[PDB]
Amino acid sequence: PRRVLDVEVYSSRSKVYVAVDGTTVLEDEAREQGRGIHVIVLNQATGHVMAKRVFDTYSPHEDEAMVLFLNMVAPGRVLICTVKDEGSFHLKDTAKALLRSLGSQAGPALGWRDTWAFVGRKGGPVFGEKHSKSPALSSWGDPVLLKTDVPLSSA
Ligand SMILES: CC(=O)N[C@H]1[C@@H](Oc2ccc([N+](=O)[O-])cc2)O[C@H](CO)[C@@H](O)[C@@H]1O
Structure with missing residues (x-):
C-alpha cells in the first residue's frame, strides 16, 4: 500500500505464484514446466518487478x-524465491552458501521435494520464510503460502 508491499508467495509440487499488492506477478501451474527455484527481484521503493527467472536446480549447472x-x-x-516440484538435487554448496549469506534459514538446508518460500532484502534482513520438508521420497513438502509485509524505501 503506502511504505509497505503486501507480498504473497506460494511453493508446491505443482504450482508457484507470487503476488505483490494484490497483483499476480508470477503464476506457473503448468505440468512438466517451470521446475526448480523461481526468483523474482523487486525495486525496493516501488515494488516493480526488475527480474524474473527460473533455475531448474533439479538439473546440473542451474545453481551456478x-x-x-x-x-x-x-x-x-x-x-523472492519459491520452489516448484524439486529444487535441491543440484543445489550445491556455493549456492547454499549464497542463500545462507542472505539470511535464509531453509534455503541452505533445502532437501528433496521440499517446498520453500522466501522474501528478503538482498543485503539482509529476511522478511519472511516458510519451508516444508518432504516426508518421504515419493512425497512432496506441504504447499506453503507465505504472506509478508515488506518495507519500502523512500526519501
Ligand atoms: C516420471 C516422473 O515422475 N518424473 C519426476 C521424478 O523424476 C525422478 C526420476 C528418477 C527418480 N529416481 O528413481 O531417483 C526420482 C525422480 O521426480 C522429479 C522431481 O520431483 C520430477 O521433476 C519428475 O517429473
Whole structure:
C-alpha cells in the first residue's frame, strides 16, 4: 500500500505464484514446466518487478547460473524465491552458501521435494520464510503460502 508491499508467495509440487499488492506477478501451474527455484527481484521503493527467472536446480549447472545471477542483484533489492516440484538435487554448496549469506534459514538446508518460500532484502534482513520438508521420497513438502509485509524505501 503506502511504505509497505503486501507480498504473497506460494511453493508446491505443482504450482508457484507470487503476488505483490494484490497483483499476480508470477503464476506457473503448468505440468512438466517451470521446475526448480523461481526468483523474482523487486525495486525496493516501488515494488516493480526488475527480474524474473527460473533455475531448474533439479538439473546440473542451474545453481551456478543462479549464483551468477544473484551476485549481480543490488543489495537493496527485494528478493523472492519459491520452489516448484524439486529444487535441491543440484543445489550445491556455493549456492547454499549464497542463500545462507542472505539470511535464509531453509534455503541452505533445502532437501528433496521440499517446498520453500522466501522474501528478503538482498543485503539482509529476511522478511519472511516458510519451508516444508518432504516426508518421504515419493512425497512432496506441504504447499506453503507465505504472506509478508515488506518495507519500502523512500526519501
Ligand atoms: C516420471 C516422473 O515422475 N518424473 C519426476 C521424478 O523424476 C525422478 C526420476 C528418477 C527418480 N529416481 O528413481 O531417483 C526420482 C525422480 O521426480 C522429479 C522431481 O520431483 C520430477 O521433476 C519428475 O517429473
